[PDB]
Amino acid sequence: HMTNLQTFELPTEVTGCAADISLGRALIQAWQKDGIFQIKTDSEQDRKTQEAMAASKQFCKEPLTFKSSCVSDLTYSGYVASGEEVTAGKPDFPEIFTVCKDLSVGDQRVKAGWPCHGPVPWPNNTYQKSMKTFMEELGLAGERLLKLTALGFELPINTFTDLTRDGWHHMRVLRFPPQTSTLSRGIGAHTDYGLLVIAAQDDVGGLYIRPPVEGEKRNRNWLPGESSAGMFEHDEPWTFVTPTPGVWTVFPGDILQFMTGGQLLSTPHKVKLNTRERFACAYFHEPNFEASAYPLFEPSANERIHYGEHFTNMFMRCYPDRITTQRINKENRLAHLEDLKK
Ligand SMILES: NC(=[NH2+])NCCC[C@H](N)C(=O)O
Ligand SMILES: [Mn+2]
Known part of the structure; x- marks a missing residue:
């Protein structure tokens, strides 16, 4: 396949042998030079990816009245309309279904009112099963990647995985419309928030990522005074992530930049609308x-x-008017965060 990125195969188990350490060095180097790499998918990883994309296509064909009903005031899981999310003051144009940790009202954290904890408003049970299976496979890959990254930095194999037990993994299931006006913005420039971003896309194309740039100051998006949203949108360089069959892409999020002191950077990225609709799934392997x-x-x-x-x-900044955000503010749910920090 004519590709524009480096592609690596991961071992099923990462044990800490010499080959694993070597692979970790290579992944770190690829992130440091390119900001991203691809991992090869096996037939089951690919099958689960394609079943998720098919379920997304079927869901997006449903009427807006139904899609809009798939929301929760407890969790951010569920539907985002085209034009609803804001990035750096401007609307983004995919329709999205967000899948966060699926916790019923029987869960102790939900009973306690913790912000963002609640059940996914699944459109149907086939969609549920397809996304759960896909995210379990994505999680296995995330754990492999975190063990390899620790090894490549000469750290204990468990350094990052010690933060990801019952991790807050989540996924954005995206459909981008075709460009119809003179607007070609899909999503504005931004970084994501956790340890890793593992993503899949169809054959259409539209994702651009920013590699590390020597001498360029990078905002630390975990600080309120250094948002990465809306940074570098129009400024070179941007690498086009050529659609390549049988791969997922991988790049760091904000936590990996913080923990490594900038040796790795949370990769800025943006999406442009193409002449056809574009399906993608972006998965977040989180603490x-x-x-x-x-x-x-x-x-x-x-x-x-x-x-x-x-x-x-x-x-909250993505979705300032969503019922989820309104209920956090109404019930003072941020106070739970202050208690946990003790
Ligand atoms: N929920 C997300 N990961 N959104 C990614 C896009 C950037 C997001 N709107 C922001 O302002 O930070
Ligand atoms: Mn993103």
């Missing part, structure tokens, strides 16, 4: 909602990122 990330290479440093606080801050 536990309660985990506090810390700098690995600066053990004098007292700075921390409480991951759940970062997620909640980000989703």
Whole structure:
């Protein structure tokens, strides 16, 4: 396949042998030079990817009245209309179904009113099964990647996985419309918020990523005064992520940039509308909602990122008018975050 990125195959199990350490070095190097790489999918990884894309296509054909009903005031899971999300003050144009951790009202965290905790408003049970199976496979890959990354930095194999038990993994199931006006913006420039972003796309094309740039200051999106949203949109360089069959892409999120002190950067990226609609799934391999990330290479440093606080801050800014956000504000659910930080 004519591709524009490096492609690696992951071992099923990462044990810490010499081959694993070598692979970790290569993944770190690819992120440091290109900001991204591809991982080869096996037949089951690919099958589950395609079944998820098919379920997304069927869901998006449903009437807006139905899609709009798939929302929750407890969790951000569920439907986002085209034009609803905001990035740096401007609307984004995909329709989205967000899948966060699927917690019923029987869950203790939901009973306690923790922000963002609640059940996915699945459109139907076939969609549910397809997305759950796909996300379980994506999670296995995320864990492999985190073990390899630790090994490549000469850290204990468990360094990042010790933050991801019951991790706050989630996924955006996206359909981008074709460009119809002179507007070609799909999503504005941004970074995502956790450890890794693992993504799949169809054959259409539209994702651009920004590699590391020597001498370029990068905002630390975990700080309220350094948002990465809306940065570098029109400025070179941007790498086109050529659609390639049988791969997922992988790039760092904000937590990986923080923990590595910028040795890895949270990859800025944006989406442009193409002449045809475009289906994609972006998966976020995240710390536990309660985990506090810390700098690995600066053990004098007292700075921390409480991951759940970062997620909640980000989703409130994405969806300022959503019923989920309104209920966080109404019930003072951010107070739970203050207690957890103790
Ligand atoms: N929920 C997301 N991950 N959204 C990604 C797009 C950027 C997001 N709207 C922001 O302002 O940070
Ligand atoms: Mn993104």
